[PDB]
Amino acid sequence: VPYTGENLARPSYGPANPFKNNVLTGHAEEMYISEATFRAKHRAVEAVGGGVMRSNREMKEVNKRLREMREDKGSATIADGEGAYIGPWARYKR
Amino acid sequence: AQKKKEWLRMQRNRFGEKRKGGFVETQKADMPPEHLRKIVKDIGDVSQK
Amino acid sequence: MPAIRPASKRKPPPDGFSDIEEDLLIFANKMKDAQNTPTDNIPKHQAQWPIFQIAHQRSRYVYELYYQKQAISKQLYDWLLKNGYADAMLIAKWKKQGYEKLCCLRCIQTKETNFNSTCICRVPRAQLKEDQDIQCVNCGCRGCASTD
Amino acid sequence: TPRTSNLKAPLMELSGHTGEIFTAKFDPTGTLIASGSMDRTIMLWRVYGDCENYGVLNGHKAAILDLQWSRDGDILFSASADMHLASWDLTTGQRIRRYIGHEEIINAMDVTQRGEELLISGSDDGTIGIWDPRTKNAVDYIETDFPITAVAVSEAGNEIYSGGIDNDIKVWDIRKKAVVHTMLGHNDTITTLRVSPDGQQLLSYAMDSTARTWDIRPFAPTDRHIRTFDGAPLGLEKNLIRGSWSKDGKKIAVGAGDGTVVIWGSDTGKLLYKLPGHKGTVNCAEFAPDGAPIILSASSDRTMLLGELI
Amino acid sequence: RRPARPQIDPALVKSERPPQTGTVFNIWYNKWSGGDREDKYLSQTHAKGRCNIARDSGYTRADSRPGSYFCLYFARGICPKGQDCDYLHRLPTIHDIFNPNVDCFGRDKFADYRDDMGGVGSFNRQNRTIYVGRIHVTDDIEEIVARHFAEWGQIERIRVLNNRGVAFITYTNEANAQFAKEAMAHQSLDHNEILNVRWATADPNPLAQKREQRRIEEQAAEAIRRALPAEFVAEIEGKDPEARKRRKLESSYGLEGYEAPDAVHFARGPNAVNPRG
Amino acid sequence: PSKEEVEATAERTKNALAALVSGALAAQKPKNVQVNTKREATFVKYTP
Amino acid sequence: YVLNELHRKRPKSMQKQSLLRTLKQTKFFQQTTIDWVEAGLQVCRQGF
Ligand SMILES: [Zn+2]
Ligand SMILES: [Zn+2]
Ligand SMILES: [Zn+2]
Structure with a gap:
């Protein structure tokens, strides 16, 4: 009491108003979750591809088309001229 | 099968030793000296707006 | 030693240095040119990008000369890593x-x-939007x- | 409310963990609490007298998901996400030894309170492990095809109740290394498996927010169910929520994702209690084993509540 | 399509000090100090570029990103980046509305105006009126103003107070007004003059006052009509006689001669006694 | 009042004054560099 | 020497935070290796 089942089961008597929130715009409470839970749910919403059922080989295939759309990375043993290493600073063609 | 893969990935992400604080932690590394050289040369006499 | 010695206290580099010395001075002159690149037209954080790019390029040259082609000795590789020619x-x-x-x-x-x-550039490109040419503010x- | 039990306060906090408390237990005497958490430590508290933290165990490289007192009350048992088990001396505070061989995260673990002493370690490589608490190598391991999140050992000491992600409570024989029967009815992953103090009923809470009591007696009908209980919702976190039986077996308590502990009557089915007070998913809800109306809740707001039932 | 045209070459665009109006350049405030205060504001110079929307428009690295602001320097005609700019390089359309904290270029709007009334503006007045002066006083002011104050947006009303060389251009969109103010400032109309395109104050003409007050009232009425259900508002004005009859018959609830109050009848909620919503 | 109420009020008032002493000591001599890299996140359940 | 030894202070020292390590914890300070002459020129120009 007042945490028992029969206390939570009883309703509030009387009629209802024909015409609360912690902050001015809604109700906000402090909560405790793991970091991984928030990161995984934010990732599921954020990543374009959150869901859409996909195994490893066709994901590697999509990676392969995305990689061949990009410019040539270059050769790291070529220090000057055409074929010089550009690397992660290679832009995507559009 | 896909539920098993998702559960294994989620539990490895959550409880792995590599993510003790939620993220992968690395050591504070040394920058190339030319980065500081360029910063100090660029800001100069602090006369540009 | 990264600290300069005059001429008579300098020790010679290990053997095989003179084969790659021209490319090493190519990288050094590229970095010296990157020191004198106008910042008047680009954001401030964009003024420091070529230095990280050239440091990556020189470190990658040393790394794939030792590990892929194996065209330099191990002693030369450790001397290059110890004398600031590559970021270890x-x-x-x-x-x-x-x-990688x-x-x-x-x-x-x-x-x-x-x-x-991490940075947004660590993300695989498949999980990013199309027509999203991200360009890291760090470098x-x-x-x-690795998949990219 | 007047005073019901022999506590310093009718309800009181225990805090000091810097991570999510995943498992909390009781002494068989009922005077000591041992809690393992996300912060890779174990905190040992004294319930009666002055409520004092008296011990910390620091040996595990990852989160401690389980810990179980022995039959006497001097040995502690840790299952941990560093892919290990551990036996701890709670006199010197040192670790006795580590149990090695599981290839994934151990989710569950149980020791035999009657008969020979064994360790029951279910782990995400689909493996139950039967361990002797004197050798660092496993006595045996039963391999399955699905990760196992809840194990329990029987009164007879030869039956293993294993729940996992295959939505079935499997009952295995140790000396045969085979399932003697499967028990269906759940549709999300089983998080706890607790045998009644008399050993006549089985409790199983799962991730569908339904707690099922099952008839476990050997001469039972084809459907070994008993009853289903609702009112303990699982929130956003997919934690391994673990429930418990009261000593008389009349009441069952299961933590909820709302910060509440939902207590039902095992025979009637009424919602006897919905106890708030936590700002996170209540990972464990335990009853005092020494005939006391005391409930301990451990929750991922890094805290435990010790309360009395009035 | 068409990429964004680079307006001025980077060789002519630098970041140099202002012309020397003193002896010591203050580097904290970046302003010349010394000399005489007779110089002070001196004069408003002629800007280094105008805009052709048909020629300079295109796509940048901003059409791919939703919510990108327009470019201040594309509006000023001196943006050299072209397609590599992070902001939009097109004209603001009629659906380019912005919240009352930023302009169309993303600069923060202020509480009150500045006394020398220019800059970003204030959010305490939905000001779509731009004040232009310093026009070479001729007889054909109106035609050249209507020709040149027309490529920046859609225009409600231009009142040319001729003889004074002053006009007040009211666009239908606030973003278009800000674009026109940042585009025509220090430009030339037909001869070599510097236009003082500033933020207009309030037209003291009572006709303009009641026009603005009314327009504010139907803007708020549009918002309220969006908020309220269609049957509710249709009973609220009551211009439709059938809606009036619906109000008389529906607001009885058994008891005759009630005519239920608007607090009870026009109420929204789960426990209200109405068709609700 | 008996020793129980007296000591309870003593505990409450000395906790409040200890918080005030901590604030005054923070204000009196700042800790040279005012940074804190133990930036632990706070999670909020917000119902609009 | 004698005054240094006579006034030889050794009271209790509490938890001391290092300035350079606390600055190294933040993102606003990086670390590199340069010639001491370059560092001295940088320090003199910065102070100016
Ligand atoms: Zn990056
Ligand atoms: Zn990168
Ligand atoms: Zn980078």
């Missing part, structure tokens, strides 16, 4: 699973972001995930 920690990340194409070390420093993330990286 970036190379150390390059030998790891998933960091990492642009720079500052893009995996998770303790120094707002929400303890100008356009995506350095």
Whole structure:
């Protein structure tokens, strides 16, 4: 009491108003979750591809088309001229 | 099968030793000296707006 | 020693240095040119991008001369890593699973972001939008995930 | 409310963990609490007298998901996400030894309170492990095809109740290494498996927010169910919520994702209690084993509540 | 399509000090100090570029990102980046509305105006009126104003107070007004003059006052009509006689001669006694 | 009042004054560099 | 020497935070290796 089942089961008597929130715009409470839970749910919403059922080989295939759309990375043993290493600073063609 | 893969990935992400604080932690590394050289040369006499 | 010695206290580099010395001075002159690049037309953080790019290029040249082609000796490799001709920690990340194409070390420093993330350039390109040419504010990286 | 039990306060906090508390237990005497958490430590508290933290165990490289007192009350048992088990001396505070061989995260673990002493370690490589608490190597391991999140050992000491992600409570024989029967009815992953103090009923809470009591007696009908209980919702976190039986077996308590502990009557089915007070998913809800109306809740707001039932 | 045209070459665009109006350049405030205060504001110079929307428009690295603001320097005609700019390089349309904290270029709007009334503006007045002066006083002011104050947006009303060389251009969109103010400032109309395109104050003409007050009232009425259900508002005005009859018959609830109050009848909620919503 | 109420009020008032002493000591001599890299996140359940 | 030894202070020292390590914890300070002459020129220009 007042945490028992029969206390939570009883309703509030009387009629209802024909015409609360912690902050001015809604109700906000402090909560405790793991970091991984928030990161995984934010990732599921954020990543374009959150869901859409996909195994490893066709994901590697999509990676392969995305990689061949990009410019040539270059050769790291070529220090000057055409074929010089550009690397992660290679832009995507559009 | 896909539920098993998702559960294994989620539990490895959550409880792995590599993510003790939620993220992968690395050591504070040394920058190339030319980065500081360029910063100090660029800001100069602090006369540009 | 990275500290300069005059002429008579300098020790000679290990054997095989003179074969790659021209490319090493190519990288050195590229970095010296990157020191004198106008900042008047670009954002401030964009003024420092070519230095990280050239450091990556020189470290990658040393790394794939020793590990892929094996055209330099181990003693020469350790002398190059010890005398500032390659970044040893970036190379150390390059030998790891998933960091083989990492642009720079500052893009995996998770303790120094707002929400303890890596850089957005660490993300595989498939999970990013189309027509999204991201360009890292740390170094100008356009995506350095291993699958990219 | 007047005073019901022999506590310093009718309800009181225990805090000091810097991570999510995943498992909390009781002494068989009922005077000591041992809690393992996300922060890779174990905190040992004294319930009666002055409520004092008296011990910390620091040996595990990852989160401690389980810990179980022995039959006497001097040995502690830790299952941990560093892919290990551990036996701890709670006199010197040192670790006795580590149990090695599981290839994934151990989710569950149980010791035999009657008969010979064994360790029951279910782990995400689909493996139950039967361990002797004197050798660092496993006595045996039963391999399955699905990760196992809840195990329990029987009164007879030869039956293993294993729940996992295959939505079935499997009953295995140790000496045969084979399932003697499967028990269906759940449709999300089983998080706890507790045998009644008399050993006549089985409790199983799962991730569908339904707690099922099952008839476990050997001469039972084809459907070994008993009853289903609702009112303990699982929130956003997919934690391994673990429930418990009261000593008389009349009441069952299951933590909820709302910060509440939902207590039902095992025979009637009424919602006897919905106890708030936590700002996170209540990972464990335990009853005092020494005939006391005391409930301990451990929750991922890094805290435990010790309360009395009035 | 068409990429964004680079307006001025980067060789002519630098970041240099202002012309020397003193002896010591203050580097904290970046302003010349010394000399005489007779110089002070001196004069308003002629800007280094105008805009052709048909020629300079295109796509940048901003059409791919939703919510990108327009470019201040594309509006000023001196943006050299072209397609590599992070902001939009097109004209603001009629659906380019912005919240009352930023302009169309993303600069923060202020509480009150500045006394020399220019800059970003204030959010305490939905000001779509731009004040232009310093026009070479001729007889054909109106035609050249209507020709040149027309490529920046859609225009409600231009009142040319001729003889004074002053006009007040009211666009239908606030973003278009800000674009026109940042585009025509220090430009030339037909001869070599510097236009003082500033933020207009309030037209003291009572006709303009009641026009603005009314327009504010139907803007708020549009918002309220969006908020309320269609049957509710249709009973609220009561211009439709059938809606009036619906109000008389529906607001009885058994008891005759009630005519239920608007607090009870026009109420929204789960426990209200109405068709609700 | 008996020793129980007296000591309870003593505990409450000395906790409040200890918080005030901590604030005054923070204000009196700042700790040279005012940074804190133990930036632990706070999670909020917000129902609009 | 004698005054240094006579006034030889050794009271309790509490938890001391290092300035350079606390600055190194933040993102606003990086670390590198340069010639001491370059560092001295940088320090003199910065102070100016
Ligand atoms: Zn980088
Ligand atoms: Zn990056
Ligand atoms: Zn990168």
